[PDB]
Design a protein around this motif. Structure first.
Motif, PDB file in Angstrom:
ATOM      1  N   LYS A 196       0.857  -1.186   0.000  1.00  0.00           N
ATOM      2  CA  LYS A 196       0.000   0.000   0.000  1.00  0.00           C
ATOM      3  C   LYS A 196       0.889   1.229   0.000  1.00  0.00           C
ATOM      4  CE  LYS A 196      -3.780  -2.417   0.733  1.00  0.00           C
ATOM      5  NZ  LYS A 196      -5.061  -2.392  -0.032  1.00  0.00           N
ATOM      6  N   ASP A 197       0.324   2.369  -0.387  1.00  0.00           N
ATOM      7  CA  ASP A 197       1.100   3.597  -0.433  1.00  0.00           C
ATOM      8  C   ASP A 197       1.530   4.016   0.956  1.00  0.00           C
ATOM      9  OD1 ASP A 197       1.115   4.314  -3.285  1.00  0.00           O
ATOM     10  OD2 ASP A 197      -1.092   4.407  -3.024  1.00  0.00           O
ATOM     11  N   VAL A 198       0.660   3.758   1.927  1.00  0.00           N
ATOM     12  CA  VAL A 198       0.957   4.068   3.319  1.00  0.00           C
ATOM     13  C   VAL A 198       0.811   2.731   4.071  1.00  0.00           C
ATOM     14  CG1 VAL A 198      -1.364   5.031   3.223  1.00  0.00           C
ATOM     15  CG2 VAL A 198      -0.070   5.172   5.354  1.00  0.00           C
ATOM     16  N   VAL A 199       1.934   2.236   4.596  1.00  0.00           N
ATOM     17  CA  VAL A 199       1.980   0.949   5.293  1.00  0.00           C
ATOM     18  C   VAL A 199       1.838   1.017   6.806  1.00  0.00           C
ATOM     19  CG1 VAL A 199       3.474   0.080   3.480  1.00  0.00           C
ATOM     20  CG2 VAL A 199       4.484   0.955   5.596  1.00  0.00           C
ATOM     21  N   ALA A 200       0.862   1.775   7.280  1.00  0.00           N
ATOM     22  CA  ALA A 200       0.644   1.901   8.709  1.00  0.00           C
ATOM     23  C   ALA A 200      -0.798   1.558   9.051  1.00  0.00           C
ATOM     24  CB  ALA A 200       0.965   3.316   9.151  1.00  0.00           C
ATOM     25  N   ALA A 201      -1.044   1.305  10.330  1.00  0.00           N
ATOM     26  CA  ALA A 201      -2.375   0.989  10.827  1.00  0.00           C
ATOM     27  C   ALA A 201      -2.604   1.876  12.043  1.00  0.00           C
ATOM     28  CB  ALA A 201      -2.458  -0.471  11.220  1.00  0.00           C
ATOM     29  N   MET A 202      -3.666   2.668  12.015  1.00  0.00           N
ATOM     30  CA  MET A 202      -3.976   3.567  13.115  1.00  0.00           C
ATOM     31  C   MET A 202      -5.209   3.060  13.868  1.00  0.00           C
ATOM     32  SD  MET A 202      -3.491   6.629  14.709  1.00  0.00           S
ATOM     33  CE  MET A 202      -2.425   7.581  13.589  1.00  0.00           C
ATOM     34  N   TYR A 203      -5.170   3.132  15.196  1.00  0.00           N
ATOM     35  CA  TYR A 203      -6.290   2.701  16.026  1.00  0.00           C
ATOM     36  C   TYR A 203      -6.709   3.871  16.911  1.00  0.00           C
ATOM     37  CZ  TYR A 203      -4.529  -1.791  14.465  1.00  0.00           C
ATOM     38  OH  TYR A 203      -4.116  -2.822  13.654  1.00  0.00           O
ATOM     39  N   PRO A 204      -7.513   4.786  16.358  1.00  0.00           N
ATOM     40  CA  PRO A 204      -8.029   5.987  17.016  1.00  0.00           C
ATOM     41  C   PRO A 204      -8.970   5.734  18.185  1.00  0.00           C
ATOM     42  CG  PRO A 204      -8.190   6.118  14.638  1.00  0.00           C
ATOM     43  CD  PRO A 204      -8.031   4.691  14.988  1.00  0.00           C
ATOM     44  N   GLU A 205      -9.761   4.662  18.110  1.00  0.00           N
ATOM     45  CA  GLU A 205     -10.737   4.360  19.158  1.00  0.00           C
ATOM     46  C   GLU A 205     -10.620   2.983  19.801  1.00  0.00           C
ATOM     47  OE1 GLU A 205     -12.886   6.675  20.289  1.00  0.00           O
ATOM     48  OE2 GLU A 205     -12.077   8.054  18.778  1.00  0.00           O
ATOM     49  N   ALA A 206     -10.326   1.975  18.991  1.00  0.00           N
ATOM     50  CA  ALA A 206     -10.237   0.599  19.459  1.00  0.00           C
ATOM     51  C   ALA A 206      -9.719   0.337  20.875  1.00  0.00           C
ATOM     52  CB  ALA A 206      -9.435  -0.230  18.461  1.00  0.00           C
ATOM     53  N   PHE A 207      -8.637   1.000  21.275  1.00  0.00           N
ATOM     54  CA  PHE A 207      -8.070   0.744  22.597  1.00  0.00           C
ATOM     55  C   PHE A 207      -8.021   1.954  23.509  1.00  0.00           C
ATOM     56  CE2 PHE A 207      -7.165  -2.814  20.186  1.00  0.00           C
ATOM     57  CZ  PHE A 207      -6.282  -2.528  19.153  1.00  0.00           C
ATOM     58  N   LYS A 208      -8.684   3.021  23.098  1.00  0.00           N
ATOM     59  CA  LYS A 208      -8.719   4.244  23.880  1.00  0.00           C
ATOM     60  C   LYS A 208      -9.350   4.017  25.244  1.00  0.00           C
ATOM     61  CE  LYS A 208     -11.230   8.575  23.644  1.00  0.00           C
ATOM     62  NZ  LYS A 208     -12.109   9.280  22.669  1.00  0.00           N
ATOM     63  N   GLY A 209      -8.671   4.461  26.295  1.00  0.00           N
ATOM     64  CA  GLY A 209      -9.221   4.300  27.625  1.00  0.00           C
ATOM     65  C   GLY A 209      -8.646   3.184  28.471  1.00  0.00           C
ATOM     66  N   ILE A 210      -8.168   2.102  27.862  1.00  0.00           N
ATOM     67  CA  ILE A 210      -7.594   1.040  28.671  1.00  0.00           C
ATOM     68  C   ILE A 210      -6.284   1.529  29.275  1.00  0.00           C
ATOM     69  CG2 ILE A 210      -8.633  -0.702  27.207  1.00  0.00           C
ATOM     70  CD1 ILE A 210      -5.889  -1.294  26.058  1.00  0.00           C
ATOM     71  N   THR A 211      -5.814   0.800  30.268  1.00  0.00           N
ATOM     72  CA  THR A 211      -4.598   1.141  30.970  1.00  0.00           C
ATOM     73  C   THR A 211      -3.407   0.539  30.212  1.00  0.00           C
ATOM     74  OG1 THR A 211      -3.765   1.261  33.237  1.00  0.00           O
ATOM     75  CG2 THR A 211      -4.413  -0.896  32.454  1.00  0.00           C
ATOM     76  N   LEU A 212      -2.211   1.101  30.378  1.00  0.00           N
ATOM     77  CA  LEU A 212      -1.038   0.562  29.682  1.00  0.00           C
ATOM     78  C   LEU A 212      -0.853  -0.909  30.019  1.00  0.00           C
ATOM     79  CD1 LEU A 212       1.745   3.296  29.889  1.00  0.00           C
ATOM     80  CD2 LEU A 212       0.669   2.375  27.840  1.00  0.00           C
ATOM     81  N   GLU A 213      -1.170  -1.261  31.258  1.00  0.00           N
ATOM     82  CA  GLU A 213      -1.060  -2.634  31.725  1.00  0.00           C
ATOM     83  C   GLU A 213      -2.023  -3.523  30.942  1.00  0.00           C
ATOM     84  OE1 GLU A 213      -1.126  -4.950  36.085  1.00  0.00           O
ATOM     85  OE2 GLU A 213      -1.905  -2.914  35.850  1.00  0.00           O
TER      86      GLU A 213
END
Lengths: 165, 165, 165, 151, 151, 165, 165
Positions: free
Chosen positions: B106-123
């Motif tokens: 793909k032209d841009v080889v990245a994956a962004m997760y704007p909402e999927a994991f928002k709010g959980i703790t680093l742990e």
């Protein structure tokens, strides 16, 4: 004047006032495990920048104040002293020119360097300075953990993601 | 309306706009070196918190957005895909439910997760999520470096020195 | 809302918009001729400051943004990629950590580094960074000319002649 | 006092060198003036010249009289010293030659094309015994305040 | 007239010396630049440099040509004189070398680390025949306007 | 300026000032009886939430500041030290990283942890932290009582009876 | 009147407040390495002006306050005392007339002379005064570094270069 009656409130370990980092600065804290050493020998401990501060950009961050303290095994009994100075040709000599010395035979076993290294770059800190550790008794590897807290300009390279393209 | 004549200015690699971290947040970026794998196999890569974020306090910091991208050897030629999802019982299945997928074709080889994991703790991030890597061709250990950038609340424990007493 | 009709005016090679240097800065542009190399081998090219910038004083100038692009012989046909990263122990590994890569298989064969090296010294740029060049096909000495454009603080040392006493 | 001559506003000074070629005693050699890469683009070759300075850097052990100058290319190399408007002589207190008016106004392209540097030594010279320094003041390169368009 | 160049406001001039090492005729020796104790603290090593002055103090009986300069450390000692931006030559009226722009801006630490002093004599030199004088202008040491904290 | 005469009023044991809990918080105080241990051995004491705080709901309460102090039999004579740190793989090592230590060889035999554990959950406190106790002399079961005082969010679960339908 | 409760914030080594020089004055700091000496012998150490201050002009600068402190090797254990007085015919007698003495058996191993030498010339300081060092234990060359900090009128001779004609 008239005598002012006061009463000194006792404080527990850990209650001392914490020194806040200057605005725009943050305090990076890391450690080093002492190497084995014979009695009354002064060992030199290299100052190495933690990984996150090794980037080309980060190692250019200016230093503010530096704090050094010792973490000893509860059974350690000799006299343990430590300091941070410019690298010496004779390790033991560092204590003769150090501006502050962390000594376990004191109520507060820390050494603060408010001005001594202010302004140098993190890279310079690691390159020009050295930590020196002395113990009247022989030391087994790990008997003493050296805590170095270096205040420096807060990096901004990680205040945003990497551009996707 | 009347046709608006425009001209699309070309941009070079690295010129994409960088996404700034939310106020009070910072972006921690770390990596992982892929393990060897056979052709068309999907490998699971554990998400481990970097040392500075492992303290009892720090691993409680809230997560914001997450970015994932791949760093490949210039000679790598197959199709390489990767994603971050909740740990699967079947690695390959992750791509069937992932909300974003980093694909080298793909032209841009990245994956962004704007909402999927928002709010959980680093742990929680390290405990609940897993990174999955697929390659149409066999992979030698290290052929691919996985870059994970996790935005989270900026820690304040290091905004001051340790109390001297 | 209302659909806005648009016409995309096509532009020829050379019509791209130029990026102006920050005020107080200027852009130095120099090149390096690639060395012969076998197919799929990624070679390391040293970054050497041009004479004008080698002086003790000029090599202290702070770096801003860095641009890298390739000049290939019209007959060169393989896949040619290049990047600028901190010197690697393994050449090929550079592409795995580079934040931008100049790829000839793209419409724009250039790579821009807006933040990566911002702030380091011109001397550090030459000492700590390296240019890496990869080709799917074998390269003969000179098939590729690497163009490095470094934005840095305007040199004041060159605002006067050497004193004639 | 010990001050450097400051370039005129809008101008900057480019300084580059040339290593002398071996030459026999009392021979006057011609050295070509070649613009450094930074000034070789067709655009930069057009920058107007201001003042020019020429000086010599010799090995400490180099003895004998060494002289040098910048003049319009000559038919006879030695004749250059008879018309030169300044001469760098190592036997003088100041071993430099300043040309504040001689070439003011020409373009860098013309400077490299019309002028030549001449070097003379009473003793034989070994390649590299003398480094010729040329400092040319010219208007600032406008073309170099931005990056090359990516497309 | 006979006036001394005054340091810029906020700056002061530190002056120290070095005694030459014995050396054979026509040999160019390298002398290390070492900061005096007063400027060795990590803080003082960071003070920015302004102008630099180098001069030689020779025994009255010392004959022959003696030259010296300060330049970035060289691979070949003698080559320093070919790129030096000023040379102290005892055969000239003024046996000094002033560097008003060459090192302006670097820190004292860099001055001692990146530059070297080179000394040449046409005749053999005995240890101490020449005293090299280096005067470096730098910003005033802030750190030295107070005593060291007693605790 | 003017010298201010002062009289330091002496205070008896028990006259120290008490630290009030943050509003919305309360302080739970419980103890643990030390296990028998040989001289110079540092033992690990598990932190167990008292029943009132074990419930699924109450163990979620956020922790504020933590206080630790020792209650020794009047006859205990050696050097007794104790601390609270994240569980160590080596018990004695805890004292090397602890930010405060309760030492009986001091005027105040207590240790306060104002920031170290702030924010973690009551359950995490019991799961991730451990109390360490060291004595220069051998200890017999019960010679030392460890007092742990944990400030946490006021429990609302206990503002009502179990429903009777 | 009303009893004022107070908390004495503990300070680490190096956190002491620095004494600013009077305006128009500056502080020169230099050292001297002790000579070997037998136990209980008090040795005389000459005060020699550093080169920067030896010139005919600079040695005329008026002295203000003088500070003396000791830098001992970490292993030095006896009682070490030192002072600055007018040269004595009997070394040990100096301690009997000194107005301040640096004693290592104190919390502050420094001695300040605020009025004793105020007004004399830098040259007189070196000519008329001597530093005396005593140790209960034998000293080997270099075991102690004497630090002398002399406040004097700011030197104007160093505000210009040597004239170049």
């Amino acid at each position: 004047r008239v005598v002012q009656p006061v009463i000194v409130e006792p404080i527990a370990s850990g209650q001392g006032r914490a020194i806040k980092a200057w605005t725009g600065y943050s305090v990076s804290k890391w450690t080093a495990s002492c190497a084995a050493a014979e009695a009354k020998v002064t060992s030199a401990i290299t100052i190495s920048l933690p990984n996150e501060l090794s980037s080309e950009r980060n190692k250019q961050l200016k230093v503010g104040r530096v704090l050094l303290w010792l973490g000893l095994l509860p059974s350690v009994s000799g006299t343990v002293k430590s300091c941070v100075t410019e690298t010496q040709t004779t390790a033991a000599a560092s204590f003769q020119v150090a501006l502050a010395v962390a000594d376990n035979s004191k109520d507060v076993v820390a050494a603060m360097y408010p001005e001594a290294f202010k302004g140098i770059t993190l890279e310079q800190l690691a390159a020009d300075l050295t930590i020196y550790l002395y113990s009247s008794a022989a030391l087994t590897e790990g008997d003493v953990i050296v805590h170095l807290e270096v205040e420096h300009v807060r990096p901004t390279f990680d205040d945003s993601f990497t551009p996707v393209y």
